[PDB]
Amino acid sequence: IENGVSMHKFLTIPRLEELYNTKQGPTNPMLFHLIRDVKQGNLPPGYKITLIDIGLVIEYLMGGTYRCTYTRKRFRLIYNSL
Amino acid sequence: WQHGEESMAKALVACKIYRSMAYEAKQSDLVDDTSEELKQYSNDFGQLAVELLEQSFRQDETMAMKLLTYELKNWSNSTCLKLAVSSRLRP
Amino acid sequence: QKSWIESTLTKRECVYIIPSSKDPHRCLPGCQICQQLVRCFCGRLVKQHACFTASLAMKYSDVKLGEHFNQAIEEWSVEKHTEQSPTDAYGVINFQGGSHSYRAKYVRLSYDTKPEIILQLLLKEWQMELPKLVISVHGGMQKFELHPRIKQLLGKGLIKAAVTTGAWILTGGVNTGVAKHVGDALKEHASRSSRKICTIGIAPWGVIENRNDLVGRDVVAPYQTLLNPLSKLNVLNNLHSHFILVDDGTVGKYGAEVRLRRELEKTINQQRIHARIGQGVPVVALIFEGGPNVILTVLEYLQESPPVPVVVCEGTGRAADLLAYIHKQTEEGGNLPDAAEPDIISTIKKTFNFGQSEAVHLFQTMMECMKKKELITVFHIGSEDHQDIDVAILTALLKGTNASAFDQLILTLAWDRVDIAKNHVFVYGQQWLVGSLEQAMLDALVMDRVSFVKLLIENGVSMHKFLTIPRLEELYNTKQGPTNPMLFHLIRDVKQGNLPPGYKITLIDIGLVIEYLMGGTYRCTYTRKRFRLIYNSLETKRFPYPLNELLIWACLMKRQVMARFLWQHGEESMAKALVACKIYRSMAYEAKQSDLVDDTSEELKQYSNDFGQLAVELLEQSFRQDETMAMKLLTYELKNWSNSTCLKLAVSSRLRPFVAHTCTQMLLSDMWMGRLNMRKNSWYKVILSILVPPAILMLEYKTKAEMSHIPQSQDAHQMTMELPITRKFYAFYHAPIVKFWFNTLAYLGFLMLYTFVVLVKMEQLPSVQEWIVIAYIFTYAIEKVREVFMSEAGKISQKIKVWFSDYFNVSDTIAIISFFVGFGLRFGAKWNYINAYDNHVFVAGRLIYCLNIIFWYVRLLDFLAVNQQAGPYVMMIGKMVANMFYIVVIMALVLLSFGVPRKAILYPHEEPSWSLAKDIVFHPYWMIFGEVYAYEIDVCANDSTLPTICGPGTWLTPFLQAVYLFVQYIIMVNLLIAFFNQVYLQVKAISNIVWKYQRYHFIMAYHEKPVLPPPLIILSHIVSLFCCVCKGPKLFLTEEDQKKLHDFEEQCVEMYFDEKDDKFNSGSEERIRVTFERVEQMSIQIKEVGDRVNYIKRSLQSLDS
Amino acid sequence: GDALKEHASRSSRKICTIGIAPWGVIENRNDLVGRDVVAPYQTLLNPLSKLNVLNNLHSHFILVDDGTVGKYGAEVRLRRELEKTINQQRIH
Ligand SMILES: CCCCCCCC/C=C/CCCCCCCC(=O)O[C@@H](COC(=O)CCCCCCCCCCCCCCC)COP(=O)([O-])OCC[N+](C)(C)C
Ligand SMILES: CCCCCCCC/C=C/CCCCCCCC(=O)O[C@@H](COC(=O)CCCCCCCCCCCCCCC)COP(=O)([O-])OCC[N+](C)(C)C
Ligand SMILES: CCCCCCCC/C=C/CCCCCCCC(=O)O[C@@H](COC(=O)CCCCCCCCCCCCCCC)COP(=O)([O-])OCC[N+](C)(C)C
Ligand SMILES: CCCCCCCC/C=C/CCCCCCCC(=O)O[C@@H](COC(=O)CCCCCCCCCCCCCCC)COP(=O)([O-])OCC[N+](C)(C)C
Ligand SMILES: CCCCCCCC/C=C/CCCCCCCC(=O)O[C@@H](COC(=O)CCCCCCCCCCCCCCC)COP(=O)([O-])OCC[N+](C)(C)C
Ligand SMILES: CCCCCCCC/C=C\CCCCCCCC(=O)O[C@@H](COC(=O)CCCCCCCCCCCCCCC)COP(=O)([O-])OCC[N+](C)(C)C
Ligand SMILES: CCCCCCCC/C=C\CCCCCCCC(=O)O[C@@H](COC(=O)CCCCCCCCCCCCCCC)COP(=O)([O-])OCC[N+](C)(C)C
Ligand SMILES: CCCCCCCC/C=C\CCCCCCCC(=O)O[C@@H](COC(=O)CCCCCCCCCCCCCCC)COP(=O)([O-])OCC[N+](C)(C)C
Ligand SMILES: CCCCCCCC/C=C\CCCCCCCC(=O)O[C@@H](COC(=O)CCCCCCCCCCCCCCC)COP(=O)([O-])OCC[N+](C)(C)C
Ligand SMILES: CCCCCCCC/C=C\CCCCCCCC(=O)O[C@@H](COC(=O)CCCCCCCCCCCCCCC)COP(=O)([O-])OCC[N+](C)(C)C
Ligand SMILES: C[C@@H]1CC[C@@]2(OC1)O[C@H]1C[C@H]3[C@@H]4CC=C5C[C@@H](OCCC(CO)CO)CC[C@]5(C)[C@H]4CC[C@]3(C)[C@H]1[C@@H]2C
Ligand SMILES: c1ccc2c(c1)CCC[C@H]2Nc1nc2ccccc2[nH]1
Ligand SMILES: [Ca+2]
């Protein structure tokens, strides 16, 4: 950051999809347990997490009427587009 | 957290994420506890907010009360004082 | 427009097309290549000239057909071939990435902007407060390199000599010039993250990357600095606030930006520093490593008028090295070693890869530089030359612009740099025209510059000479400095109206404030006839004691740091710190009362209590030096502060740590004795002497050499001067301790009689024991009437308000009224001879007595509180009754929670009644106090006192009552116990102070109480009033004793300001602080020095080998 | 006197400097003319001045009076004549 990485340029959708979907670093087993709960089922075998699935967590974690950028129609439409 | 903006709404969302994760840990036991490692992580964010409110209240008591009620619009049209109440942050 | 910026400023665009190349490097029909690779003297390409009409001028090749006298065009007039337009850019650069998204601003203006047009946006649009200094940096444009010492040391100064001042640094902005290194200092030496040094970096629209990103009206340009070495456009340096993007119509090239830089650096030298100062904001110039055009422009400052100085530093590099290398030669300019001019030109030859044909004029340019070796401050970075660079810059301005030491002082007074003054203005032999020093004090005072006040006092400004009437009239009437809005609100109140439009405050109007703030009978010098006559008239137009007039000024204008400075100077330091504490405290109460501005009211009560603690810490220092004289310091009439006292002031400021200090508590006891010596005597002998008057003569009195420190009455001092027997009875009976124990034995003879009347039957007429009782209260009433009329004031509205403000003057009024209601109904009534107590008027007054009696037994806690063990419990019995009200409301919510069900469940056939108001409150209250009503619980049980209350639902009450008492005793009563345990140590360390402070008002009520007790005090009223129809306790010091006392106060103040100095400078946390700061400054001169040693030994062994 | 301030001892009866002054090189000589008078003395550092102001940090003075003004003289006589009788008084 102190040598010229403006996160606006480096935070695209597919990059940040990885950052959740990496065992290549310190991981939290809750996140793969939360996502399978809100989906109300069982994750398929491979299952790269989608950012929609994260919104369904944070809107579940924060709770009440919290509505995250990920679940909204704008993001949900440019996401399935790409 | 310390980078970006909205540093008082980010430290009260964080404190509510962890706190709401910790309560899932205690509820379901599929792994090691982790649940007191988070409640110390939440209360670490839920104390930078409070120590940042004081720093504002000690600079302008008026505006520092606007910092508690301005609709945020990045954090779901919410408030830096409705979050704390949701994290049950008393300080 | 909604934007004054683009309403005023404009933008240059090349509105015409001028090719600059003709030869077809490729594709012989030049029209094709001229499209994409033939640029204008506009700098931009011929097709980048969109300019909508010029976009259609992208015909076959462009404007001006190929031949057109081939060499014809090649000029690009910036006047008509480059028109103006409203600015399309103006926003805030984001600098996305690098430190918390630090901000900066711009417009993209044209250099067309006249110099005055450029200044009149920087202030009002960007809200950049006017500077005290200007540190334009005119060094090298191409990047250069420095040594680790000079890198950070020059980064100390550009932070130091600019954070103190305002210092609009003028840079190039780009991250390649001097703009590069200056920004690196702003981060390494990152000041307190605030409005730091606002660097106003003029940028060209030429060497600039992301120029398109700047094109936005109110747009946060998402700017990002690429360090791509293939890049050529220069990115703006990171640490720079507000930019000026000078727009010449061209791109990539230099030019116009240099024009603006003079043209703002010349109008800021035309703006004034501050309303008080008449000078203009000066301008300096700093050089880092320079260049060929630099050596030219360094000089023209030294030539042009006004003589803008320069701070060319020697260590930086190429040009600046040699401009300073020549300073080590070429002594006083014209003297020139002709053998060195080949040598230095040989140094010029090697640095700039420089020509010898050009070696005369560039060398010549360094001559007129050296002809002006007075204001070219060649800072020798190596040594301590003139100091660290911070001082060098500020020192360069003073010494060199042909300015008087006054004119040098008025600048440093604006900068608020005292160290400049103590070591470059107050140095040595120097003219110091005395009238000048005076005028400078007038300016340091109106602002707040305490440090120059101290400086000027310590260089010969006797305030007696400099405090005349018209000067001090200003000091109130200046908005040219930190002001207090109260003062203009107080003055319009006491005048009872509205100030006229202009209204310079008169010092009379101030007296009407201080006599209102301090209050009571305080009468200030200003309102008196002497001052009021010499004032309207206009060394008589001076003041006797000036720092008594400035100290009441700095406390009305909320200038603490001056008040602490003017307090510690002068004399009467303990009366000045208790007047101040009363001024602020009396200002704070006006703030809370009227809300026309921000509160300010807790900013003062901390300012008062800061003066009301230096007094107390100065009493202790005296009491610890001579307990006797230190009790004279509390009672000597002051005569500068309205014939007042350093202990009547504290009482008016309600300052408890002074009145309840151990020196105001010995004196109050030495005043409690009187002439008696109740050290040698005993309390038995007082009472023995009051009832046996001859035993007065067998008492051990004090001598008038022991009563020196005690204040004595008017005629009391007359006695001692001119022990005889008539002066034994006068000395005893006029002692407070005697006045006390001569009432307490009439009052305890009052309470033994009234009690006797209360308890014993009461006949048609009062008895002997009852007339004496009426007589006490009457004469006790009069004694409280007279206590009003003589309560040392003029306002009846204020006397009456301070009388009823004491707890007992009300209760006594309740108890005196009630008694004569009682005697009214008791005596003013009929008599039913067959049976008394049938007359409900008689009964009524009878029962006023039996209840009025309670007022008089609680009096005894006034008398009983004289003791130092008892009183501090009598004061607790109140501070808990207050703080416990809410535990006791709950206990009455629990008491009706039980009483209303218990009374409904058990007594269900109740018509409305007043017994439903008792019976829901009665038993549940006595339950709290040991009672259970055991044979009334379970009314259906066999062992019942209430076998008639049995019926449907009455089995619920044992449960209700079980829950009730559990809540009362086991929860709420132990909440009281727990309360009284934890509010005991608090209220005990307060009830002492509340007691020691009511002691003043008790003892100093006996010094003006009569001698005779309130059954026969009437004689001492009779024999004070009919004698009054025919027509305080002061410290009588001779003349030398005033002198010995003043010598004592001066001595004790000196120690106070000297022991605090020791307790801090020779503590621990301060001593770790110094040991840190030493080992800092050591370790710098360890590694530096120790390096050099190694650079010797590696040589020394090679010198000999 | 400059040492008496830089190294300002505990503010008390410090070293009582008994500075013999002549009635010669002395400014504000008229201000000194007062029987039991607090001479409102002020040191002017006017470089145009020629009369020498008393140094700040000095307690008790001896203003030796020769009848003349501006010139030296008599003061040196006293200085032996006190420095010779104090060598005649005993320490204790
Ligand atoms: C014998 C048969 C009849 C009598 C038996 C029954 C007697 C009933 C009980 C009586 C108890 C009497 C003592 C308490 C009353 C206050 C005393 C006082 O000085 O208070 C204050 C004066 O505060 C003021 O503001 C100035 C004057 C207030 C007068 C208020 C009278 C209230 C009592 C109504 C009349 C009752 C008379 C009923 C009779 C018609 C002193 O201060 P403080 O109180 O320590 O604290 C408050 C602080 N304050 C000053 C900022 C406010
Ligand atoms: C420092 C200031 C604080 C102290 C305040 C001090 C002032 C004190 C304040 C007092 C105010 C209270 C009111 C006045 C009291 C009487 C009220 C009353 O009811 O009177 C009654 C008697 O009235 C008579 O005239 C006959 C008896 C003599 C009156 C003696 C009371 C006045 C004494 C005052 C000496 C005070 C001077 C003290 C010296 C300064 C009238 O009613 P009644 O006759 O019962 O009705 C008949 C009914 N029946 C026939 C059916 C039976
Ligand atoms: C159902 C029953 C329910 C209860 C009924 C009531 C009973 C309980 C209550 C009783 C008294 C209520 C009124 C007076 C007290 C109020 C004031 C106080 O508490 O302290 C205040 C004054 O007072 C003092 O500082 C001194 C305390 C005086 C002692 C009280 C005598 C009680 C004895 C009577 C024995 C007679 C017994 C027999 C009677 C027949 C001090 O408080 P503070 O915190 O400093 O506040 C600020 C003060 N300031 C503004 C001056 C700075
Ligand atoms: C939730 C928190 C925990 C609570 C703890 C337990 C709570 C309490 C539990 C108590 C146990 C239950 C007791 C009542 C049982 C029935 C009584 C009955 O049948 O008749 C009785 C009627 O009298 C009553 O019913 C009155 C209620 C009893 C007293 C309540 C307890 C209070 C003291 C203890 C509270 C703390 C004790 C602590 C416990 C160790 C008597 O017989 P009878 O003949 O019908 O009446 C005489 C009429 N005759 C003369 C006309 C014939
Ligand atoms: C805890 C250890 C001790 C033992 C525990 C074992 C418990 C066993 C208990 C069992 C209760 C049942 C027995 C009574 C019914 C039979 C008839 C009877 O006597 O009726 C009575 C109703 O009195 C009651 O109903 C009593 C209270 C019932 C609740 C018992 C306590 C609950 C537990 C505790 C928590 C409760 C809350 C407490 C606060 C937290 C009326 O009879 P009387 O009063 O004589 O009136 C007769 C006259 N009359 C006809 C004119 C009206
Ligand atoms: C305002 C201030 C005044 C100052 C005080 C001095 C002036 C006041 C003094 C005296 C006034 C009274 C004089 C009149 C004659 C007395 C008659 C009488 O009652 O006699 C009784 C005694 O006396 C008492 O019982 C009442 C008087 C004395 C005790 C109460 C007051 C004590 C306080 C004041 C002194 C100590 C103070 C110490 C405190 C530190 C005896 O008679 P009896 O009981 O009726 O029974 C007789 C027998 N027979 C019925 C069978 C026949
Ligand atoms: C300055 C302030 C003054 C205060 C107000 C002054 C008020 C003055 C008020 C009254 C004076 C006049 C008295 C007569 C009243 C009319 C009724 C009447 O005549 O007789 C009736 C009296 O009935 C009662 O109730 C008498 C007692 C009431 C007194 C209440 C005072 C409260 C003040 C508390 C202390 C205040 C403390 C203040 C603290 C600051 C009945 O009696 P009778 O008919 O004569 O004959 C017997 C009847 N029988 C046949 C049935 C047996
Ligand atoms: C007529 C014949 C003669 C005898 C009659 C008189 C007998 C005596 C009467 C009372 C008792 C006091 C006697 C001892 C006094 C010692 C001196 C002393 O220190 O006094 C203190 C208290 O001073 C007071 O005045 C306290 C109040 C007493 C009078 C009111 C009665 C309260 C008690 C009744 C309540 C109801 C209880 C009812 C219980 C049934 C004040 O001084 P200090 O600050 O403590 O001083 C110590 C340091 N110094 C000395 C160096 C200064
Ligand atoms: C020891 C206590 C009694 C003596 C009273 C005399 C001393 C009282 C002295 C100081 C205390 C506080 C100030 C005085 C009260 C003013 C009103 C008030 O504050 O109301 C408060 C609510 O209060 C309620 O809601 C109470 C209403 C019901 C009163 C019933 C009394 C019950 C006790 C009857 C006995 C049954 C006992 C049963 C068995 C134990 C409102 O809060 P506030 O005003 O913002 O707060 C205080 C602000 N202040 C401090 C600046 C003023
Ligand atoms: C009458 C007024 C009513 C209106 C209220 C006044 C308000 C209060 C004002 C003022 C207060 C003081 C003066 C008035 C009260 C005392 C005088 C008095 O009334 O004596 C009475 C005589 O009483 C006796 O002969 C019995 C013993 C007492 C005599 C000495 C008086 C008491 C005070 C001594 C020590 C302190 C004094 C020393 C000071 C240096 C006369 O009263 P009377 O009602 O005319 O007579 C009725 C019948 N009787 C004769 C049987 C009693
Ligand atoms: C917050 C708290 C809740 C509880 C409570 O305080 C406030 O609410 C209050 C209301 C009161 C009643 C109002 C009116 C009357 C009528 C009157 O009728 C006279 C008739 C006749 C007599 O014979 C005249 O001749 C008798 C008294 C009674 C019932 C009051 C009793 C006390 C009560 C219950 C008070 C109780 C302590
Ligand atoms: C009950 C008891 C005393 C008191 C009150 C209430 C209300 C305030 C006045 C106070 N009286 C008092 N007498 C004193 C004698 C000596 C020193 C301090 C004293 N304070
Ligand atoms: Ca009990």
Coordinates of N, CA and C in Angstrom, one line a residue, chain C residues 156-208:
Chain C
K156 N 14.1 18.2 9.9 CA 13.7 18.8 11.2 C 13.3 20.3 11.0
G157 N 14.0 21.0 10.2 CA 13.8 22.5 10.1 C 12.5 22.9 9.3
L158 N 12.3 22.3 8.2 CA 11.1 22.5 7.4 C 9.9 22.1 8.1
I159 N 10.0 21.3 9.2 CA 8.9 21.1 10.1 C 8.9 22.0 11.2
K160 N 10.0 22.5 11.6 CA 10.1 23.3 12.8 C 9.9 24.8 12.6
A161 N 10.6 25.3 11.6 CA 10.5 26.7 11.2 C 9.2 27.0 10.4
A162 N 8.3 26.0 10.2 CA 7.1 26.2 9.5 C 5.9 25.8 10.3
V163 N 6.0 24.8 11.2 CA 4.8 24.5 12.1 C 4.6 25.6 13.1
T164 N 5.6 26.3 13.5 CA 5.5 27.3 14.5 C 4.8 28.6 13.8
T165 N 5.3 28.9 12.7 CA 4.7 30.0 11.8 C 3.6 29.3 11.1
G166 N 3.0 30.1 10.1 CA 2.0 29.5 9.2 C 2.7 28.8 8.0
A167 N 3.6 29.5 7.3 CA 4.5 28.9 6.4 C 3.8 28.2 5.2
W168 N 3.3 29.0 4.3 CA 2.9 28.5 3.0 C 4.1 28.2 2.2
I169 N 4.6 26.9 2.3 CA 5.7 26.5 1.5 C 5.3 26.5 0.0
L170 N 6.1 27.0 -0.9 CA 5.9 27.0 -2.3 C 6.8 26.1 -3.0
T171 N 6.3 25.0 -3.6 CA 7.1 24.0 -4.2 C 6.7 23.9 -5.7
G172 N 7.3 22.9 -6.4 CA 6.8 22.6 -7.7 C 5.8 21.5 -7.7
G173 N 5.6 20.8 -6.6 CA 4.6 19.7 -6.5 C 5.1 18.4 -7.0
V174 N 5.7 18.3 -8.2 CA 6.1 17.1 -8.8 C 7.1 16.4 -7.9
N175 N 7.2 15.1 -8.1 CA 8.0 14.2 -7.2 C 9.4 14.1 -7.6
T176 N 10.0 15.1 -8.3 CA 11.3 15.1 -8.9 C 12.2 16.2 -8.5
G177 N 11.6 17.4 -8.3 CA 12.3 18.6 -7.9 C 12.7 18.6 -6.4
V178 N 12.9 19.8 -5.9 CA 13.0 20.0 -4.5 C 11.7 19.6 -3.8
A179 N 10.6 19.7 -4.5 CA 9.3 19.2 -4.1 C 9.4 17.7 -3.7
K180 N 10.3 17.0 -4.3 CA 10.5 15.6 -3.9 C 11.0 15.5 -2.5
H181 N 12.1 16.0 -2.1 CA 12.7 15.8 -0.8 C 12.0 16.5 0.3
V182 N 11.3 17.6 0.0 CA 10.6 18.3 1.0 C 9.4 17.4 1.5
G183 N 8.8 16.7 0.6 CA 7.7 15.8 1.0 C 8.2 14.7 1.8
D184 N 9.4 14.2 1.5 CA 10.0 13.1 2.3 C 10.2 13.5 3.8
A185 N 10.5 14.8 4.0 CA 10.6 15.3 5.4 C 9.2 15.3 6.1
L186 N 8.2 15.6 5.3 CA 6.8 15.8 5.9 C 6.3 14.4 6.5
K187 N 6.9 13.3 6.0 CA 6.4 12.0 6.5 C 7.4 11.5 7.6
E188 N 8.7 11.6 7.4 CA 9.6 11.1 8.4 C 9.4 11.8 9.7
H189 N 9.4 13.1 9.6 CA 9.0 14.0 10.7 C 7.5 14.4 10.7
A190 N 6.7 13.4 10.6 CA 5.3 13.6 10.5 C 4.8 14.3 11.8
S191 N 4.3 15.6 11.7 CA 3.9 16.3 12.8 C 2.5 15.7 13.3
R192 N 2.0 16.3 14.4 CA 0.7 15.9 14.9 C -0.3 16.0 13.8
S193 N -0.9 14.9 13.5 CA -1.8 14.8 12.3 C -3.0 15.7 12.5
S194 N -3.0 16.8 11.8 CA -3.8 18.0 12.0 C -3.8 18.8 10.8
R195 N -4.2 20.1 10.9 CA -3.7 21.0 9.9 C -2.2 21.2 10.1
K196 N -1.4 20.4 9.5 CA 0.1 20.5 9.5 C 0.5 21.6 8.5
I197 N 1.7 21.7 8.2 CA 2.2 22.8 7.3 C 1.6 22.6 6.0
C198 N 0.7 23.6 5.6 CA 0.0 23.5 4.4 C 0.9 23.9 3.3
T199 N 1.5 23.0 2.6 CA 2.4 23.2 1.5 C 1.5 23.6 0.2
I200 N 1.7 24.8 -0.3 CA 0.9 25.2 -1.5 C 1.8 25.0 -2.7
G201 N 1.8 23.8 -3.3 CA 2.6 23.4 -4.4 C 2.1 23.8 -5.7
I202 N 2.7 24.8 -6.3 CA 2.3 25.2 -7.7 C 2.8 24.1 -8.6
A203 N 1.9 23.5 -9.4 CA 2.3 22.5 -10.4 C 2.0 23.1 -11.7
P204 N 2.9 22.8 -12.7 CA 2.5 23.1 -14.1 C 1.6 22.1 -14.6
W205 N 0.8 22.5 -15.7 CA 0.0 21.6 -16.5 C 0.9 20.9 -17.5
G206 N 2.2 20.9 -17.4 CA 3.2 20.4 -18.3 C 3.7 19.0 -17.8
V207 N 4.7 18.9 -17.0 CA 5.3 17.6 -16.6 C 4.4 17.1 -15.5
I208 N 3.3 16.4 -15.9 CA 2.3 15.9 -15.0 C 1.6 14.7 -15.7

